[PDB]
A paper describes a structure:
The structure of LovB adopts an X-shaped dimer architecture, and the LovBC complex reveals the position of LovC which binds to the MAT domain of LovB, forming two complete L-shaped catalytic chambers. The LovBC complex adopts an X shape in the front view with two wings. Starting from the lower region, the KS and MAT domains are connected by the linker domain (LD), with the separate ER (LovC) domain interacting with the MAT domain. LovB alone is ~176 Å wide, while the LovBC complex is ~294 Å wide. The adoption of a pseudo-twofold face-to-face symmetry of LovB, in connection with LovC, creates two L-shaped catalytic chambers. The chamber is chimeric, with the KS, and MAT domains coming from one chain, and the DH, CMeT, ψKR, ψER, and KR domains from another. The LovB–C interface is approximately 522 Å2, which is mainly contributed by several residues in the loop region of LovC and α helices of the MAT domain. At the same time, the MAT domain Mut1 abolished interaction with LovC. These observations suggest that the loop within LovC and the helix of MAT domain of LovB are essential for the formation of the LovBC complex. The significance of LovB–LovC binding for the integrity of the catalytic chamber was analyzed by an in vitro reaction assay catalyzed by LovB–LovC and LovG. Figure 4e shows that the interface mutation abolished the synthesis of DML acid, in spite of the full catalytic competence of the mutant. We conclude that the formation of the LovBC complex is essential for the integrity of the catalytic chamber to the complete total synthesis of DML acid.
The first isolable intermediate of the lovastatin biosynthetic pathway, dihydromonacolin L (DML), is constructed by the highly reducing iterative polyketide synthase (HR-iPKS) LovB, which partners with LovC, an enoyl reductase that acts in trans. In LovB, the β-ketoacyl synthase (KS), malonyl-acetyl transferase (MAT), dehydratase (DH), methyltransferase (CMeT), acyl carrier protein (ACP), and ketoreductase (KR) domains are active, except for the enoyl reductase (ER) domain. LovB terminates with a condensation (CON) domain commonly found in nonribosomal peptide synthetases. In DML biosynthesis by LovB, the initiation and elongation of the intermediate chain are carried out by the KS, MAT, and ACP domains. ß-Ketoacyl modification cycles are also repeated, but the tailoring domain usage during each iteration is highly programmed and permutative.
Author numbering:
A (entry chain B): 119 to 235
B (entry chain A): 2 to 343, 353 to 451, 471 to 548, 555 to 683, 723 to 735, 761 to 782, 794 to 1089, 1100 to 1231
C (entry chain B): 939 to 1055
Amino acid sequence: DLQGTSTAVYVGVMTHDYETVSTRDLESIPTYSATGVAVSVASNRISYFFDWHGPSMTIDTACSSSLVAVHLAVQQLRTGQSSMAIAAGANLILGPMTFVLESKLSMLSPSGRSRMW
Amino acid sequence: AQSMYPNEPIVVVGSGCRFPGDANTPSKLWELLQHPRDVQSRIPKERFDVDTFYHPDGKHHGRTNAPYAYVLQDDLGAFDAAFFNIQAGEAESMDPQHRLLLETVYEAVTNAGMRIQDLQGTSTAVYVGVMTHDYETVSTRDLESIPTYSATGVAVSVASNRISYFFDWHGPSMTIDTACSSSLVAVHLAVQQLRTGQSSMAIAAGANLILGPMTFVLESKLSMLSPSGRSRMWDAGADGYARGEAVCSVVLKTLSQALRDGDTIECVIRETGVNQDGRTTGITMPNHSAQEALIKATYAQAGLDITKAEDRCQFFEAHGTGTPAGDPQEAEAIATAFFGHERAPLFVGSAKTVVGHTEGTAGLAGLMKASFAVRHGVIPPNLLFDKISPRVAPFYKNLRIPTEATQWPALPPGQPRRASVNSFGFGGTNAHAIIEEYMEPLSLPLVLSAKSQRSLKIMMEEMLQFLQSHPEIHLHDLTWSLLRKRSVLPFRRAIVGHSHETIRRALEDAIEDGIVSSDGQPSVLGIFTGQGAQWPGMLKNLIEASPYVRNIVRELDDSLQSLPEKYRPSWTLLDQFMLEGEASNVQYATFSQPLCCAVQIVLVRLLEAARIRFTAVVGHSSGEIACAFAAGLISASLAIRIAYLRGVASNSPDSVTFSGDAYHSHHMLPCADPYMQALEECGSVPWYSSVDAENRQMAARDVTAKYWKDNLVSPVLFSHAVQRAVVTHKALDIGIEVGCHPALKSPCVATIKDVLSGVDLAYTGCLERGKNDLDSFSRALAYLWERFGASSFDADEFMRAVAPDRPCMSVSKLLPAYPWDRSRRYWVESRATRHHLRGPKPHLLLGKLSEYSTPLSFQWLNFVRPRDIEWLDGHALQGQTVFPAAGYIVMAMEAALMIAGTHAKQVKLLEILDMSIDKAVIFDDEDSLVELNLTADVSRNAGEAGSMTISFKIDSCLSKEGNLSLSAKGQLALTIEDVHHLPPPEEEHPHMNRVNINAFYHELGLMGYNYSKDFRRLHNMQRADLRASGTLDFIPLMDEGNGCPLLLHPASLDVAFQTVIGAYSSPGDRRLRCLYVPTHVDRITLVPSLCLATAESGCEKVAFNTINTYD
Amino acid sequence: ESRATRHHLRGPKPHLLLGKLSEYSTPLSFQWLNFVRPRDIEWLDGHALQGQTVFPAAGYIVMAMEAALMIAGTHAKQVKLLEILDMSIDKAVIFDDEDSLVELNLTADVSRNAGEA
């Protein structure tokens, strides 16, 4: 039903740990690494698999990335150019690059939990 | 109008560009685009030595086939961190993409004619399109040495978040990533945001920088990059795209918003549709049907009919990456959208041919190309287009690729030039934008500012050079743009000059001086010069130059005519003394009084026209009358009339001037009676009288003729009036001596300091002693601005009142961009990371030397697969392709060579000792990758003794899931020099049975040795008495990346090893009943000079002797 | 999981005075990578020469002995005796400030693995 339609995609990812992990050693990089780890492909490949023709943004506004993608999907749907919009987000802990980067600023919680307020 | 479209059209008010080929500004970018040059160049070593990663085979492991890119000539490490209040650590942490984005956004804001303060705290939006985060993978490749602020400096989202943070903006800050289309998709999002009205302004920016080979290797793995190094759009040479560096910032606003804000429009983004390719034949493969639908929907949403030529665009900035398959799809999509429903052709020009494929900002690069083309009405050419691609010819019937700066085609009247921008990112996210040109149906001080005094001096120098280059530009427009349409910064300096020559000389004087001010304050203290301070020829320049001053002079003439016939006319000094060149002396009361009064009236009227809020303190005589006018309750005509009629002091606590044998004495005591009597029949701002002390400082009793009489009879309490005004308004910002300055500067400022103990307020005089009136007024405005920013006065209103004809055009586009300090280079070249980006050539059989390799310890890292090493398929054992045991020896000898080169030594002799092959390397398939790590520690660097002992170990791992294991080890004893060694070969054995080489290799294959092609290479051999001798091919091997020959082709050394087997086993005798592989060598000794000489001389066919000692 | 990348993500504990063992380290060849700064090593401020904080010459010996321990553990061997021979300190390490990072790379090639002997 959605195959070939104008369904939109808006993916919010802050971390690309795989792209820095799989590509840390330039050797052994697989042939399709560019499209497999490129951030934009996060949404472009979703649309490609589902044959969708709506906008495919891989948003990155840090922690808000996914909600910003939700906002963009809302705008697209209100425009009426997309009968459907996938507001998605993704964050995975595949390498310590992000962990070291954030702990350098003490952003991460040493206790290991987000003790709200 | 052009704003009547179904969706409000977005307009590019400004742009900031850092494009390759010195295109560090929109003007240079346009000049390059319409006059393209071979911008592309070999990747600079400062970025990364691509020769360390180059290899003809794009699919080669850890290599890139594209050693060229359209790289920026700017040193991206340089950055004006002080400008953005960024610490050195954070600046080093910052991704150069983010830094250049900040610089380009500020450049566009300047070009848009918008001040940081004006946009500070507003809801301006940001949408940044970046595809590559090379810095984040480069600065973070070595987790050690990572700076503290690395997370926020390299995080992609910060690309936009930091722009907004620096500019204090509150609009959405998206760092889009749709691959090549990222920036154009960001433009679309900005368009949507602006159409929602939630953001008065939106920065649609993009950034792609070549800081590391990660992206290059990734893309070359798919052959996406162009090995030729250029994006040959729709050309038969289409073999990919050439990566380009670019950081583009485009300021976007609603057309109505821009017009009401009066920003210099570049082009109108009528509509920006975004679509994505479906399940195409591959993720990278674009879909022509999807792009055609995108174009059709974009045109429909703009109220434009695709079929109709009037609505259809004349130019189409295409993705045009030179991809072998993407370009035909794009051409088909364009042709079907604009044609196929059936005659001049439609022009299609891809910006990626000139500035290269800038990836994330490729969309914005094309957008800038289309914008400049539509604005200047010139279709820029495409540098790389020699012959139409055969796959593109079928869809090229109705399309033309311009190779020259072709002029825009014919247009219907009233139809703006229309161009299209298209950008396809791998994955298929296609962004299409429709752009249209906007139809467009006394000198202010030249103010310059910077965040650093050095930057301000560079600003002055660049402005002087620009003026020398652009003397034609109107001075009023330039000054107004620098005042209202330009940001104000803590370091300030304002120049004074009537005309371009005067402004240039004043710029030179300011540059010589170096005096610059440092770091909502419009209030001023109106100080009025009294009688006796007048200078010859006051207002002559203002009257002769400013028509507004001429109208004020007409008002003064009317006031003169208003005098009763008893005294009318007090001879018109306005036409008798206020003349340039003559400037006759004026001290007589009849002329000195009205002259000074008119001077002060004109000055205060001009200041009010500049929207300067006043707190008025009266002087004496003409000063008193002019101040009474400044209160806003007395008409100017009445004040000048009173001054004309009268024509016929405690300055400070420590300075007084009591006149006499004059005014305020018995001399004028009776003379003021007729003056008061005639004044009775002859005629909102805080105002403080000095004739009376705080009692008649009122808004109703100042009009009484008695007060006017007392003006000339009472001792003026100017000090007391100043005290009252300053103490009452403790928040006073500055005081201006309105009139013939200097008359009260020292006493008035001393009074201000005394009243406000130890507090010195700004002082200014708008008409200097015997100086040009224009220069004096401009200097007063300069003081006001340098002290209190743009809030000091409103230049727009001043130009509205002064010289209404030719309203100032915002020429900030033409003004030079802010000169960034660039004194310090902010980068994170971790020495391991630097040795990764930089380093030695990727030596064959060894790969790239490890980042953590010393001159004493080395570890060459390689992932050998047989197909990459063309000759490695020959050495096959039991069918499996086995890395030759001689391969380890060749690798060790090459490691010895590289070690000697590191120490600058040259190896006269190369010995190996106690070598061992612990584990043979087995290649499952020609594409299988086996890691080889040749560690080498020089245990004894004795170049003083002419020797070098090196312990080497070739570690191997047959699979990524396996552990690293030893494959070979041993020692290398090198006899070296600071820049006959071997025994002569034994006399050939007398009797030797000829060996049938083909039969010999057949027998070996029967035993298990599947030697093939280059590894056979045994011209002849003859064996006897356990010995063998003959001729073997010393085939040369050279690494193209390293550009030098190797000591040994492992094929030749493995053939030499096969000589031992031949001596042991004759062909067809089956003595070699089991497959023997080398497992230990007591000593291999090679003379590198002779081997290199044989390899280069072409006499590869060499002789050999071997003794099968143990059998 | 490129074996170098795997040894980066995985691997031995980050031994003090040595850092993390290099991704390309064999049971026969080792290269411990570290970026020593005095404040991270609480005790390193003590050894100051001419005012400058200098990495102790005994620090290199301790690092070498710990490298020997890790090598023996890699081969599962336990060191009954630990000898150093012909050691040399070619260049002293000078720390400009307690936050200054100085890279230390302890390469170690076991020239003779004679556990049989």
